[PDB]
Paper text:
Like TMP, the PLA binding mode is dictated through hydrogen bonding with Asp27EcDHFR or Glu28DfrA1/DfrA5, and the propargyl linker forms π–π interactions with Phe31. However, unlike TMP, the bicyclic moiety forms van der Waals contacts with helix C (residues 43–50). In the DfrA5:NADPH:UCP1223 structure, UCP1223 makes van der Waals contacts with Gln29, Met51, Leu54, and the bicyclic moiety is swung out of the pocket, exposing the highly polar benzylamine to bulk solvent. Interestingly, the UCP1223 had a distinctly stabilizing effect across all three enzymes, agreeing well with our crystal structures where a racemic mixture of this ligand is likely adopting different binding poses for an optimal configuration. When superimposed, both structures of DfrA1 and DfrA5 complexed with UCP1223 and UCP1228 show a clear density for NADPH.
Two plasmid-encoded dihydrofolate reductase (DHFR) isoforms, DfrA1 and DfrA5, that give rise to high levels of resistance in Gram-negative bacteria were structurally and biochemically characterized to reveal the mechanism of TMP resistance and to support phylogenic groupings for drug development against antibiotic resistant pathogens. Expectedly, all three enzymes form the stereotypical DHFR fold with an eight-stranded β-sheet, four α-helices (B, C, E, and F) and three catalytic loops (the Met20, F-G, and G-H loops).
Author numbering:
A (entry chain A), B (entry chain B): 1 to 157
Write the structure that this text describes.
Amino acid sequence: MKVSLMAAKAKNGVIGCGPHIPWSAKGEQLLFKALTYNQWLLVGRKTFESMGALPNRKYAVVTRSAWTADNDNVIVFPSIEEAMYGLAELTDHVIVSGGGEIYRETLPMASTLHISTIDIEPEGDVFFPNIPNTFEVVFEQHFSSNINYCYQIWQKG
Amino acid sequence: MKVSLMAAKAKNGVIGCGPHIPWSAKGEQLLFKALTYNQWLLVGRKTFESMGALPNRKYAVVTRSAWTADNDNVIVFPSIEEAMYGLAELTDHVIVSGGGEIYRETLPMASTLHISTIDIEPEGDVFFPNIPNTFEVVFEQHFSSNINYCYQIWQKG
Ligand SMILES: NC(=O)c1ccc[n+]([C@@H]2O[C@H](COP(=O)([O-])OP(=O)(O)OC[C@H]3O[C@@H](n4cnc5c(N)ncnc54)[C@H](OP(=O)(O)O)[C@@H]3O)[C@@H](O)[C@H]2O)c1
Ligand SMILES: NC(=O)c1ccc[n+]([C@@H]2O[C@H](COP(=O)([O-])OP(=O)(O)OC[C@H]3O[C@@H](n4cnc5c(N)ncnc54)[C@H](OP(=O)(O)O)[C@@H]3O)[C@@H](O)[C@H]2O)c1
Ligand SMILES: CCc1nc(N)nc(N)c1C#C[C@H](C)c1cc2c(c(-c3ccc(CN)cc3)c1)OCO2
Ligand SMILES: CCc1nc(N)nc(N)c1C#C[C@H](C)c1cc2c(c(-c3ccc(CN)cc3)c1)OCO2
């Protein structure tokens, strides 16, 4: 089973400020919706609680507590290793969709990254990890919008 | 100016049947939406007449006749060459978006290809061109839907 990572980050590395994403770039959301359509997503419990089970996707959520979802479209796992083994029975592909913590824990597992860089330098306390040079860009496209953004796809080795 | 080309084709290469696209693969048009957002498209007259001028895009349309368009986001050119020369004064990137005729005439000038292959083999009368082997796949993702589809990004070597 292949692991992809999909994230949006500001030019200063910020991805979150408290429970919010500190920007609104018109259009960027389309990339995320289009590439995750009917895909399995892996997300942290805090991020899942912020966005909820939006339609046409399937969710694997990790928690260290007894937290549960209430939605037959979500599977809660006690660990990332357990989520990976569980998903592997059900799918060939999972897309890691965030939490700052989830990103840092799963970047080493990812063979493909989908990275939107937003032309803004906001304040926030949550940051995307440095992209290791075990990955390289194979595709890139710029978008002009109310806030501009650049979309890149990175592949491993 | 960069030239990309974006197309959805069935597994038998059909892209059209009269003025229609002969399938409904739920989800696939999101890829088209996301990648064309605030982009310039090059379309043929026949294709443009079918879809119409959806928002957040600019259109270059080519025709050999007296056909014109009201919409203020559309520029009509008499030839592919004039459209390319004209677009280059206006944009850094254009996305050829079809017509079988337009695809054949412009594939040689594209640096990047976005191809969705739809899991169907319908009857039709318009076909996508042979992809030269100067292009290679650098990304691929499978989608399950009512009709499955596979998204591939090709780059020219
Ligand atoms: N691309 C983006 O710009 C993007 C995307 C999504 C989110 N965000 C932002 O990121 C911020 C939230 O990130 P965050 O790091 O605070 O939270 P998070 O990663 O969404 O969730 C962290 C939680 O997930 C659970 N968890 C993490 N690793 C686990 C493991 N190995 N095993 C079991 N459970 C595990 C824990 O749940 P418990 O607390 O239940 O134990 C932990 O508290 C928000 O600001 C949000 O807006 C940005
Ligand atoms: N990716 C996809 O699956 C996709 C995308 C788009 C369209 N389609 C399908 O493709 C079919 C349409 O393709 P098509 O080949 O019949 O038509 P088309 O390529 O969309 O348009 C052909 C017309 O474009 C103009 N044209 C072409 N080359 C020109 C040139 N060198 N100089 C000036 N004008 C030029 C001419 O317009 P005039 O007749 O006005 O002179 C010509 O009749 C439809 O069925 C549509 O559903 C599929
Ligand atoms: C485009 C973002 C985006 N772009 C890219 N490149 N990669 C990504 N990983 C994400 C993302 C994301 C998160 C999971 C997300 C995705 C969403 C969300 C919301 C949302 C969260 C909280 C609230 C509460 N106020 C409302 C909505 C959150 O709503 C539509 O989809
Ligand atoms: C999107 C498919 C698609 N996917 C990919 N990868 N590449 C493409 N080049 C196209 C295409 C196309 C054509 C030009 C097209 C042809 C049409 C269309 C529409 C259309 C109709 C309704 C809506 C809803 N807003 C959006 C688009 C789009 O209406 C009938 O004729």
